Design a protein around this ligand. Sequence first.
Ligand SMILES: CCCCCCCCCCNC(=O)NC1CCCCC1
Ligand SMILES: CCCCCCCCCCNC(=O)NC1CCCCC1
Lengths: 487, 541
Amino acid sequence: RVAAFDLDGVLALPSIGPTEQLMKGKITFSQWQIFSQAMAARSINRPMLQAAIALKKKGFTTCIVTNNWLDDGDKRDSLAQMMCELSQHFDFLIESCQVGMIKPEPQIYNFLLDTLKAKPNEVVFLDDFGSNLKPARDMGMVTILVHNTASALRELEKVTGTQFPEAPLPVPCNPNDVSHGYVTVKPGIRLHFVEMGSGPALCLCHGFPESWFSWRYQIPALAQAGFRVLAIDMKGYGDSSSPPEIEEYAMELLCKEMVTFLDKLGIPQAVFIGHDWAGVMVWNMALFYPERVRAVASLNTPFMPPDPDVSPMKVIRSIPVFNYQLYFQEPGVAEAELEKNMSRTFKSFFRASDETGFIAVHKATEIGGILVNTPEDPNLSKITTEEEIEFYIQQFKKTGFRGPLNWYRNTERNWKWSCKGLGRKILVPALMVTAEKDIVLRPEMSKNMEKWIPFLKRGHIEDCGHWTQIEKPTEVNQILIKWLQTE
Amino acid sequence: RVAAFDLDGVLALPSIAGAFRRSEEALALPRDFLLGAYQTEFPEGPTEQLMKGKITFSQWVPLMDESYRKSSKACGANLPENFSISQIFSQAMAARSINRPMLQAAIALKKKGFTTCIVTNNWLDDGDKRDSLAQMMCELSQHFDFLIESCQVGMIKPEPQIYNFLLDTLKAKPNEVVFLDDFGSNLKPARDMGMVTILVHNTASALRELEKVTGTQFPEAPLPVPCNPNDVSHGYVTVKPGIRLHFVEMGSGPALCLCHGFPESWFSWRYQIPALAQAGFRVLAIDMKGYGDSSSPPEIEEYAMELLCKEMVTFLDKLGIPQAVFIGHDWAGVMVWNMALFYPERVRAVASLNTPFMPPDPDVSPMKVIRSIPVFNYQLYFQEPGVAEAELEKNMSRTFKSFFRASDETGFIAVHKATEIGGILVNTPEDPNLSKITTEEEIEFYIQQFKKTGFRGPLNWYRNTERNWKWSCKGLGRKILVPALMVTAEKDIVLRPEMSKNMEKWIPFLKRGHIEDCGHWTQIEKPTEVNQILIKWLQTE
Ligand SMILES: CCCCCCCCCCNC(=O)NC1CCCCC1
Ligand SMILES: CCCCCCCCCCNC(=O)NC1CCCCC1
């Protein structure tokens, strides 16, 4: 079925002849004040926008039929953003000032069903007036008024269809419904990414074994937060070049290229928010290229400078919760296990802080592999949808697993490199977000990070596993936004 | 054969060193007091952990500050107790910009086939204003093959080991390589090794003079920074099922999309894109529907201006951009004005090249107005599908060198005769001469581009006359009340300037720009100006 929504005050609040032609479109705004400001005060009616994606996801045809008008005002920008935001969550836009006719003139209505290809019955309209809803039900449409700021609305709306949650999730941007940039930094290597919103720029780098798609919940919000996001596919993963050479992944290089990728893209500075392995790079970016980093934020991953008199490898042979990691060392091995069956491999890796079928991070060598435990047919974690997983699959089907793993296999070199930035410190805006129930990459591993990063601001989330962006998304967003906001 | 230059005093001016100087005298400081912390074969203390990249900048202040305070009252003149060097080294670094002529001198050899690069005594600026450096550094980025940052390779000038590290990568001998510095004390090693020394003193000329003497000659008014070849980002937005729009990106916001005309491609703005970016903008040289790497359907309806504008809008939403500056030329320009006319909200501002805002006559068949204007015959010729195509496709080489010619050049197109002699390239030479406005390669791109898209799609732009008319007739009671720019070309045969004159009846406040001796290919004929005009425009709004 389909869902129709007015705008005057059904998807934006506060709510709100000759200029009856202003509606029709023969006249613009700057055509005729003490009223302008009012259109700028109103914002999106989130729970309603929710109620929409709801159906949209549920297999309906959403849409907006409003009594528009052309805004050439001094503050139309607003409308744009709102418009450009609602854009993605509807199939058709029946703007009054676009099709000549305006509510409640019956010709507009006939125009909708017409484009909608539907019968008045299997279509429900939503208006805060009712004088505009008379036609709808008259036609055989399921009418629904507003009067208030929703609730009662979304309520008698639930009835027709399904139910909506009180505390929802941030809209998961996706899939192809996005732009796909492609920068070629070195001959054989090109880095694919994603883009959204207008500057300043902040690149979101993922970890192991993930993809840009991971930030699927941060990207939109972050954009709408007034930013130009660049969910990049880290070298080796997804649509970016994934060479077979190990040297190709030395952190020293990854950071260098990361920089190139900027020049190429003509961006002179960006905010670098990293997680997992990325997070490592992010901190090194901050450490080696201050100029190009506007600011840095890290999830789970803490800044752990290297010990100059302590073989980096030894520090791994030590920490017990880094076995699997060791297991990865040998090329072909680790790969062979994860590739053998990507389905499991993933539903396996991706599990909540409070969930079964965990990975074998420490018994790895001994039991023969990071997955030697765990069921065969893992259960879908209440953190990824089959589809959500399938993307990761398709992604990896084309890239393989060697490339990503080669991130681990550059220990000595990495050590030898990060040793140069031992006499200096991170003096650019920084953020360290710690996860609580994160088995490996435990919070307490930061504690002395300030010895290196004074002024370092922090953020911490409870009941959060390693998959922060996907486990506690809404919070991650908040924390992140509010962070950028205050700097 | 390569050529390198110590950025501060060669690529960047006024040499930061100058600031120290003018600061010494300021506080009656004996010649070279705080100067040592920069110009001294005494690379020691903190200033040596700085260029060495061991410690950042911010640290180098509290440390250097006190290391200065060393000889403060001890062995030397009075150096204010609380006296620091933070915000004084900071300004000097910011107040400095790129040495345009010298950069020129570089791209020269680069073009000429040399291995440019920069060997500077760097330091990692984690300053409150380190951005500046990023930009200037992000710019010089593309013009050099190698960047030898002192603060990145451990060694700093003039310690021999650095130099021996450069040739190592440049895989060259001391003889076939030239070094540019503003000190000379830094140049001493170079000569001794076997390199071509040159005191980058003075400011320019004199340097480029003694330079010229060993390379070639440099333009007096060089050709603006061109953004090509494949050294760019390539976005790809899918607006409707089968249709996806490819484009190009550069710099940081706000956004302004550059739409091309017929028969061109994003590559046309190759001269505006960079400059525009460097002008503080995020450019989107888009490949108009039908052209190059964007979907180029076979349907005619697919190109109704009404649609092109709609999709143009979608392309924005999709890209998450809520507003942009729309600068159009030719057919694009038309759309651009309609964009302004139909979607005010999404247009921050509009600029048009050659193409004027010509609303439609409500009581005058749009077609008739074409059958009338004599300089629109070829256009008419295009009407019939397959025909026009067949002519332009038969041999893209000519087709292009043909279309693309200067205001003052031969082999013109047959804009009015067409229909009669059947064709536009009909009476044009067999093998046209390369116009002093496009390089063979420049043309080849257009070829490859069109080889994959064909010619139907682009032409379908012409074939939507009635519909277009019927549509633009809706925006007859309103006007363009958003910032606008109308740039007129002088020697533009078709799309003559005088066709604007009453544009203000529709667009008050409409600002204008006009260029002389300019044909239809404005962006390629008078690029530098187009840039200026455009920039200065955006600048003042
Ligand atoms: C002394 C040098 C120390 C360098 C430390 C670099 C940081 C290592 C981060 C490793 N991260 C991961 O291995 N993540 C995987 C663990 C298994 C489940 C998915 C996520
Ligand atoms: C619906 C009314 C349309 C009115 C058309 C106004 C002017 C459109 C611009 C046309 N531009 C061109 O035809 N340019 C070509 C002309 C032949 C040589 C290359 C450039």
